[PDB]
Amino acid sequence: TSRRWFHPNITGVEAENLLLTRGVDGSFLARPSKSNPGDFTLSVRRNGAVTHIKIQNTGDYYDLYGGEKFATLADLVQYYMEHHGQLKEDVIELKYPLNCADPTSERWFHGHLSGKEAEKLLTEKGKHGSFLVRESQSHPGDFVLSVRTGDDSNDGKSKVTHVMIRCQELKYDVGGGERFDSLTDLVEHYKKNPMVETLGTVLQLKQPLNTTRINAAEIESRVRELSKQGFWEEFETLQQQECKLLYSRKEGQRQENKNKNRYKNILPFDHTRVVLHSDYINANIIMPEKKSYIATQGCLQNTVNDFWRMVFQENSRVIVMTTKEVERGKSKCVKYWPDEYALKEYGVMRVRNVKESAAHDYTLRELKLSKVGQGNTERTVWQYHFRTWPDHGVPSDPGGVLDFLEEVHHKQESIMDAGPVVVHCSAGIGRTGTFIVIDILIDIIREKGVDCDIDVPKTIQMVRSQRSGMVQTEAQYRFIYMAVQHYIETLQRR
Numbered sequence: 001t002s003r004r005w006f007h008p009n010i011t012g013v014e015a016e017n018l019l020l021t022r023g024v025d026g027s028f029l030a031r032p033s034k035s036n037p038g039d040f041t042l043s044v045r046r047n048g049a050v051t052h053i054k055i056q057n058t059g060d061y062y063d064l065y066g067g068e069k070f071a072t073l074a075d076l077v078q079y080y081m082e083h084h085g086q087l088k089e090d091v092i093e094l095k096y097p098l099n100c101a102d103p104t105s106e107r108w109f110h111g112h113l114s115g116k117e118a119e120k121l122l123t124e125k126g127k128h129g130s131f132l133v134r135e136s137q138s139h140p141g142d143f144v145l146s147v148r149t150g151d152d153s154n155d156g157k158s159k160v161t162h163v164m165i166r167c168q169e170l171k172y173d174v175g176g177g178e179r180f181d182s183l184t185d186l187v188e189h190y191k192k193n194p195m196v197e198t199l200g201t202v203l204q205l206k207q208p209l210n211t212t213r214i215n216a217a218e219i220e221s222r223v224r225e226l227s228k229q230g231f232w233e234e235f236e237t238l239q240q241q242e243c244k245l246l247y248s249r250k251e252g253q254r255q256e257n258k259n260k261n262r263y264k265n266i267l268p269f270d271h272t273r274v275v276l277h278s279d280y281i282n283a284n285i286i287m288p289e290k291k292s293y294i295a296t297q298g299c300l301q302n303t304v305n306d307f308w309r310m311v312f313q314e315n316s317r318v319i320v321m322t323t324k325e326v327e328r329g330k331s332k333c334v335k336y337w338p339d340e341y342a343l344k345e346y347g348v349m350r351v352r353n354v355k356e357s358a359a360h361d362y363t364l365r366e367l368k369l370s371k372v373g374q375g376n377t378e379r380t381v382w383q384y385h386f387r388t389w390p391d392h393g394v395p396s397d398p399g400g401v402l403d404f405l406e407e408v409h410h411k412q413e414s415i416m417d418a419g420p421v422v423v424h425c426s427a428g429i430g431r432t433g434t435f436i437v438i439d440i441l442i443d444i445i446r447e448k449g450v451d452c453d454i455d456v457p458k459t460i461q462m463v464r465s466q467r468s469g470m471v472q473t474e475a476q477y478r479f480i481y482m483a484v485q486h487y488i489e490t491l492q493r494r
């Protein structure tokens with residue numbers, strides 16, 4: 001629960017020299033692979049030298065070359081830090097995190113801000129405990145910590161306080177006392193032991209100032225601002241918080257459930273998993289914080305029957321399939337529906353394919369699900385199979401996805417008693433999280449209009465607290481922004 005071992009702005013050479021001059025045998029760090037965008041590299045020191053292990057994320061999961069697949073870098077690191085003797089060349093041990101000092105991935109670091117801007121933002125958007133750290137324009141190389149204190153203006157009950165931070169010999173201080181190795185160490189220190197002014201005011205550092213909430217109508221401008229690197233800084237800052245979602249996943253780790261996971265390490269949270277009324281399926285309920293989703297994996301051969309038990313149990317009437325049955329040569333989902341016009345039984349569940357409708361970007365399958373033994377349990381389940389998603393990367397234009405979800409939305413709305421919408425791909429976190437986050441953001445705009453606030457990272461973080469790894473890559477993070485922008489332009493044209 002730390003994640004100081006990730007260095008977002010480090011070359012392969014610098015990582016080698018940091019392990020050799022400030023590390024020891026066992027010291028490790030992770031960095032984004034500059035060789036290919038979207039990849040990563042685990043750099044470990046061993047026997048007086050540096051070994052680089054490749055981690056690939058094409059959009060579905062983190063693939064540790066020579067290792068196992070994970071939903072987050074945090075789980076990857078924790079897995080091998082606790083299972084000493086799994087990563088091998090001769091076992092290669094992860095012992096000591098080489099902590100990063102870069103604050104460019106901290107939610108509260110706004111190097112650009114000035115004095116007035118910091119006060120204006122903290123005044124207009126901030127509440128009690130809202131703080132931020134910026135670089136001082138007065139003293140080149142120093143920083144300033146701004147904090148708003150008071151009660152939730154124009155009365156004096158609240159105020160803003162500026163606390164200078166001096167950077168001397170690679171370490172930071174507030175003018176006296178202890179000196180910290182980085183701004184993060186300084187901040188985390190005063191989040192526990194807040195400063196106390198001479199007259200009693202406690203400079204509490206509750207939450208960082210929110211700068212990612214925007215008005216939907218003004219999405220076009222925020223997109224341009226994030227393009228000359230902004231997306232990357234904002235996305236890795238979201239990744240920096242993944243270590244705050246280390247929730248219980250005991251049920252998926254039982255022996256009797258191990259073979260129900262397409263990837264043993266990608267598991268559902270206990271507190272949001274779908275419990276079947278034998279009870280286990282790798283799926284989670286996603287509740288936006290009326291319409292909910294079930295984010296789940298692609299069916300294994302031995303989980304098709306459980307999959308339909310879930311669909312029936314939850315009264316789901318729509319399935320969003322976002323992957324071909326095979327991609328890049330490897331399987332991603334077992335065909336769990338019968339051929340057109342055919343009827344087939346999956347355990348106690350019975351499925352008829354009434355008719356298939358081919359579209360440009362997807363295939364629709366009108367399915368009639370029922371329970372064997374009782375001829376009053378029949379309901380129509382509409383499977384929307386999106387088939388035009390590239391094996392590598394993301395769509396170049398979001399119109400296909402948006403038209404796809406627009407149709408999926410209206411079907412769901414036309415069924416009164418409908419339960420959660422089932423969305424799945426390979427591991428059910430990458431594309432599945434992308435489709436679900438876009439659907440959530442689009443829902444808000446369609447209801448409240450373009451004059452509403454939306455917050456992309458906050459929405460992804462809220463979804464990640466219900467299933468780990470939702471939305472996997474920066475390409476998918478950027479594509480979400482583009483889909484929202486495209487949808488906004490449609491509304492403004494009509």
Ligand SMILES: CC1(N)CCN(c2cnc(-c3cccc(Cl)c3Cl)c(N)n2)CC1
Nearest residue numbers: 104107109233234237238241457458461
């Ligand atoms: C410029 C900067 N150094 C990087 C971008 N920026 C921010 C701010 N806030 C979030 C955020 C918002 C809601 C939930 C979560 Cl979990 C997060 Cl992390 C974020 N992802 N980036 C500010 C500082």
